[PDB]
Amino acid sequence: EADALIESLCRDKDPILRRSGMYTVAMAYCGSGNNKAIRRLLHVAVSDVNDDVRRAAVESLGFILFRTPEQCPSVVSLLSESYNPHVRYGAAMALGICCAGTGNKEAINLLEPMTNDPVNYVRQGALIASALIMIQQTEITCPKVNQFRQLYSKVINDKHDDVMAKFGAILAQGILDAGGHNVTISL
Amino acid sequence: VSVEAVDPVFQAKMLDMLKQTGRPEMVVGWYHSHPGFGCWLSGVDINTQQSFEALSERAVAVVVDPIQSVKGKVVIDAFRLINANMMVLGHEPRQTTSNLGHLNKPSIQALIHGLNRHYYSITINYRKNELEQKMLLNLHKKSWMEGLTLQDYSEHCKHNESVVKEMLELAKNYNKAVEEEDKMTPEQLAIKNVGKQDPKRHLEEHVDVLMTSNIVQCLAAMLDTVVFK
Amino acid sequence: AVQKVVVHPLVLLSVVDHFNRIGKVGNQKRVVGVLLGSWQKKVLDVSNSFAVPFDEDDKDDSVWFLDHDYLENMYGMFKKVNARERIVGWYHTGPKLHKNDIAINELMKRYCPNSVLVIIDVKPKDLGLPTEAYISVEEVHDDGTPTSKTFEHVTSEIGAEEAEEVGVEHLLRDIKDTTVGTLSQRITNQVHGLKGLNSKLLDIRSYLEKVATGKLPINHQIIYQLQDVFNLLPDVSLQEFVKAFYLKTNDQMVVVYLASLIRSVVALHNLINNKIANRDAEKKEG
Amino acid sequence: MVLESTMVCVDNSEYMRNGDFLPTRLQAQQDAVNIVCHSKTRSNPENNVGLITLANDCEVLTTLTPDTGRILSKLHTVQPKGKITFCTGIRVAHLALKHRQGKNHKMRIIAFVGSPVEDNEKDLVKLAKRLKKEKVNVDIINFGEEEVNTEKLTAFVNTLNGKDGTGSHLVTVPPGPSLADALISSPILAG
Amino acid sequence: RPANHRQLTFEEIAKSAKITVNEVELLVMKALSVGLVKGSIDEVDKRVHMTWVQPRVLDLQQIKGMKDRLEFWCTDVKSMEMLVEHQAHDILT
Numbered sequence: 001e002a003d004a005l006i007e008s009l010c011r012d013k014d015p016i017l018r019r020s021g022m023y024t025v026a027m028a029y030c031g032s033g034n035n036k037a038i039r040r041l042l043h044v045a046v047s048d049v050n051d052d053v054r055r056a057a058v059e060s061l062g063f064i065l066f067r068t069p070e071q072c073p074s075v076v077s078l079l080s081e082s083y084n085p086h087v088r089y090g091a092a093m094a095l096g097i098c099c100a101g102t103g104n105k106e107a108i109n110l111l112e113p114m115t116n117d118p119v120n121y122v123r124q125g126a127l128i129a130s131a132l133i134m135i136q137q138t139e140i141t142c143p144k145v146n147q148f149r150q151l152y153s154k155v156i157n158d159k160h161d162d163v164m165a166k167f168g169a170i171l172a173q174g175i176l177d178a179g180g181h182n183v184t185i186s187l
Numbered sequence: 188v189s190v191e192a193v194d195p196v197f198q199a200k201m202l203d204m205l206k207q208t209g210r211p212e213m214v215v216g217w218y219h220s221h222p223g224f225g226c227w228l229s230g231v232d233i234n235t236q237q238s239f240e241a242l243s244e245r246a247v248a249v250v251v252d253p254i255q256s257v258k259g260k261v262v263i264d265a266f267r268l269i270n271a272n273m274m275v276l277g278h279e280p281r282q283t284t285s286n287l288g289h290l291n292k293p294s295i296q297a298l299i300h301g302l303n304r305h306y307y308s309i310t311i312n313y314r315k316n317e318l319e320q321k322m323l324l325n326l327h328k329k330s331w332m333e334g335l336t337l338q339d340y341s342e343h344c345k346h347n348e349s350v351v352k353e354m355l356e357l358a359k360n361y362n363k364a365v366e367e368e369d370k371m372t373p374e375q376l377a378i379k380n381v382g383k384q385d386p387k388r389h390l391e392e393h394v395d396v397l398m399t400s401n402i403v404q405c406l407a408a409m410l411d412t413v414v415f416k
Numbered sequence: 417a418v419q420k421v422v423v424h425p426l427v428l429l430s431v432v433d434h435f436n437r438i439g440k441v442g443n444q445k446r447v448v449g450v451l452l453g454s455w456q457k458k459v460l461d462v463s464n465s466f467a468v469p470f471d472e473d474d475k476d477d478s479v480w481f482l483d484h485d486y487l488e489n490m491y492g493m494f495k496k497v498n499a500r501e502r503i504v505g506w507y508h509t510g511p512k513l514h515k516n517d518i519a520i521n522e523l524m525k526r527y528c529p530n531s532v533l534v535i536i537d538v539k540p541k542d543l544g545l546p547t548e549a550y551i552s553v554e555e556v557h558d559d560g561t562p563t564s565k566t567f568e569h570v571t572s573e574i575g576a577e578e579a580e581e582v583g584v585e586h587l588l589r590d591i592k593d594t595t596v597g598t599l600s601q602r603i604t605n606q607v608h609g610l611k612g613l614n615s616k617l618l619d620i621r622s623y624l625e626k627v628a629t630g631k632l633p634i635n636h637q638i639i640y641q642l643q644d645v646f647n648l649l650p651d652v653s654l655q656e657f658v659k660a661f662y663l664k665t666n667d668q669m670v671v672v673y674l675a676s677l678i679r680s681v682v683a684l685h686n687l688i689n690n691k692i693a694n695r696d697a698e699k700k701e702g
Numbered sequence: 703m704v705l706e707s708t709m710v711c712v713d714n715s716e717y718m719r720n721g722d723f724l725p726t727r728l729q730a731q732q733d734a735v736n737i738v739c740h741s742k743t744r745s746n747p748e749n750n751v752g753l754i755t756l757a758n759d760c761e762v763l764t765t766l767t768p769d770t771g772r773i774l775s776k777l778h779t780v781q782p783k784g785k786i787t788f789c790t791g792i793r794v795a796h797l798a799l800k801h802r803q804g805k806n807h808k809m810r811i812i813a814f815v816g817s818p819v820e821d822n823e824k825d826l827v828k829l830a831k832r833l834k835k836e837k838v839n840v841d842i843i844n845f846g847e848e849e850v851n852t853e854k855l856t857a858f859v860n861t862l863n864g865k866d867g868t869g870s871h872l873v874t875v876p877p878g879p880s881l882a883d884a885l886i887s888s889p890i891l892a893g
Numbered sequence: 894r895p896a897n898h899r900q901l902t903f904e905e906i907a908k909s910a911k912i913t914v915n916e917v918e919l920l921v922m923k924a925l926s927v928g929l930v931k932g933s934i935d936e937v938d939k940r941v942h943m944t945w946v947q948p949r950v951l952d953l954q955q956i957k958g959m960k961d962r963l964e965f966w967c968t969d970v971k972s973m974e975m976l977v978e979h980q981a982h983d984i985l986t
């Protein structure tokens with residue numbers, strides 16, 4: 001039904017409504033049932049000059065490609081270190097939502113370049129994306145000491161960091177401690 | 188810049204002349220320029236700001252300084268006045284701390300936090316409707332285009348035979364002027380093969396020379412169209 | 417007298433303001449603005465301008481409303497803040513030239529010096545240049561018609577001196593610069609045929625209509641020069657230009673040798689590193 | 703006090719310099735504009751007074767403003783050209799009433815007619831229907847005459863004058879060597 | 894004749910003006926002396942090549958032929974625009 005609605009509302013002059021077309025088509029195409037919307041999702045993610053639809057673009061990509069956790073980092077690995085920090089942050093949200101509740105290390109091995117950058121956006125979304133994967137995981141299976149220690153050094157390193165970096169840092173630390181390891185999330 | 192320079196009968200006169208026209212908007216702030224010594228505000232400016240903020244609680248203040256600013260960026264910043272009684276409590280209890288990353292672009296290490304006490308700033312965004320987008324966009328494209336758009340094409344199409352030939356011969360003089368070193372390159376490349384010491388690439392410059400040389404190819408079809416019909 | 421003029425986009429964005437401060441009333445008539453510029457030098461340079469409340473009548477076209485006190489007060493204060501610019505003329509946003517424009521322009525012909533006229537469009541759908549400088553001078557006609565005000569087209573250019581280029585470039589962030597090469601050339605070479613097609617096709621239809629269905633002499637005398645210049649290229653047989661095609665095609669051959677040879681030089685580092693890097697990384701990987 | 707706009711239309715034809723009537727009564731009706739503008743100034747100084755003629759090419763001599771100091775100067779250089787123009791003389795002010803500053807000022811327009819009317823009865827009933835339609839106070843002052851004073855102008859006023867209660871009045875001056883000031887100041891419009 | 898071998902000969906001039914062949918040189922010399930024509934002929938055997946000229950009165954067959962050649966030029970420019978732009982927009986954009 002929403003093919004002509006989203007296709008018609010995609011060429012709107014308002015960038016907010018341009019984000020609303022992708023957020024709207026996100027839940028409509030859940031289940032990886034349409035390989036066509038990704039054409040204009042990534043086409044507006046790379047082609048458009050405004051960073052609003054660029055950082056708000058790949059959330060629909062993760063919402064439609066949430067089925068397979070392995071295929072996501074192969075196509076968003078280029079977006080991990082993108083041109084502008086906005087696609088890096090929205091891509092960090094994409095890795096946060098696509099690999100949540102799973103055990104795929106294809107994002108975990110890429111989290112180390114995400115956590116060190118002069119921009120606080122990719123650091124915040126990197127700590128959130130790292131916080132959405134370490135939940136419900138044992139240490140003996142995978143060596144998580146790196147992200148546990150670098151995630152624990154943010155609350156002691158907050159004196160020399162940004163004011164929002166510690167906000168997303170402790171906010172990311174509240175994700176693992178949520179419910180005392182008893183409750184988790186599932187897509 | 189002073190409170191005495193602001194003539195209330197001139198201000199209210201021009202504002203009334205704007206009220207009799209299609210401008211039913213009240214004043215929202217005052218702006219000025221601070222050349223040389225930085226965009227910061229002196230004591231007189233903060234005193235006339237304190238005196239001019241009694242009516243409007245917002246009192247937006249903008250300082251433009253295009254004198255030392257390069258033509259690459261026109262980044263401008265808006266200023267604000269903080270309450271002197273808020274020194275006990277938090278300085279700026281402003282929510283939505285996301286845009287502060289965009290407010291961190293003016294990160295000069297002397298003015299912003301060199302005088303940040305009792306003097307902060309605010310974020311700035313823009314807005315553009317479709318009439319400004321198409322009128323200003325087509326106006327700028329036309330500002331880079333011709334009148335009839337067919338005038339200055341044949342000028343270069345026929346200057347390829349008169350003037351560009353000199354640029355093609357000189358272009359070949361630079362090409363050979365690099366090939367004389369490219370004759371010596373296979374010796375070093377035939378000796379060391381480890382590491383790069385010359386910062387010159389010798390490739391992208393010749394690619395650009397080919398791009399300037401493709402004007403003859405792209406305009407040959409133009410001459411074919413002008414000759415055809 | 418004046419060969420060309422220079423119009424800054426600030427006044428046209430002030431026409432965007434003319435379309436902004438309407439207030440949704442339902443009139444959207446040809447609001448007349450007081451054009452300002454520098455008449456001192458031979459070339460005309462518009463820096464800024466302002467407006468005056470202008471209202472006409474529905475039926476009668478000869479009704480026009482201007483103001484002298486508002487013009488002398490806005491011009492007096494504007495001259496007090498900036499005395500380097502003075503009154504030159506005016507401009508209307510209407511797409512059609514009405515008969516009352518001789519009376520509207522006549523006021524600024526009496527009080528002000530010779531005013532230039534600029535016709536623009538209310539909707540920026542016209543692909544052509546929106547600004548046309550029309551000088552208000554009286555010309556002698558050969559047919560014997562009495563001398564009247566004639567609007568001769570003066571060429572115009574849209575340029576910015578120091579800051580408006582930076583402001584426009586920052587506000588757009590979509591337009592591209594000159595960027596000589598493939599894209600900026602091939603786009604002009606693709607859409608240029610439509611850039612002349614909409615103009616000529618848009619003009620010769622109403623022209624051919626006014627040929628047979630025309631009266632009230634439209635200066636048919638200039639049509640003889642029109643068809644004359646159109647017949648100044650009587651489908652040349654291209655016999656003499658063959659050697660010119662040999663010259664331009666020989667330059668084409670020069671571009672062929674430059675492309676093949678230079679690209680063959682570029683193939684060196686690629687077609688060497690592809691081997692020495694792959695075989696050494698492979699033999700040293702394990 | 704009284705918040706209303708005042709518009710006066712004076713004739714600039716050569717019919718105002720005939721030696722039978724007052725010696726170039728243009729100055730006399732100029733003094734009439736002076737006493738009505740100074741009288742309205744004494745009543746309410748916030749009233750704006752405009753100046754315009756009834757020639758072929760109508761020109762706004764002075765914008766609506768209470769400052770009469772420059773209006774006194776603008777009353778000169780009348781440029782005695784043209785004979786009469788009625789349609790664009792009405793439309794040049796009654797439609798220009800919307801350009802006033804104070805929206806609370808009522809609409810009042812007078813006119814000094816020194817030439818015979820060239821418009822037929824159809825234009826009189828169309829313009830009278832327009833002015834009665836938009837409900838503008840119209841005072842007709844006719845100085846000098848060639849034919850009978852009021853033959854069709856009587857029905858023009860009766861069809862133009864609505865709101866019979868305290869509505870508009872008609873000013874018809876007969877021939878006489880006396881001044882026109884006291885004769886036009888007799889109705890309630892002056893004072 | 895606007896096109897189709899504009900080149901001509903003195904036989905039509907001498908035939909239409911009933912003048913001899915010795916006076917056609919003074920005739921074209923006077924034609925160039927008046928200034929209404931700029932025609933310069935590089936001929937060897939006697940020929941008459943002409944250049945820009947103004948009718949200045951009227952031509953209806955040149956109005957209809959003006960519509961024919963004008964519409965032909967317009968539809969040819971349109972044909973080249975649709976032809977080049979057709980695949981050119983699809984491969985380059």
Ligand SMILES: [Zn+2]
Nearest residue numbers: 221222223224
């Ligand atoms: Zn200073």
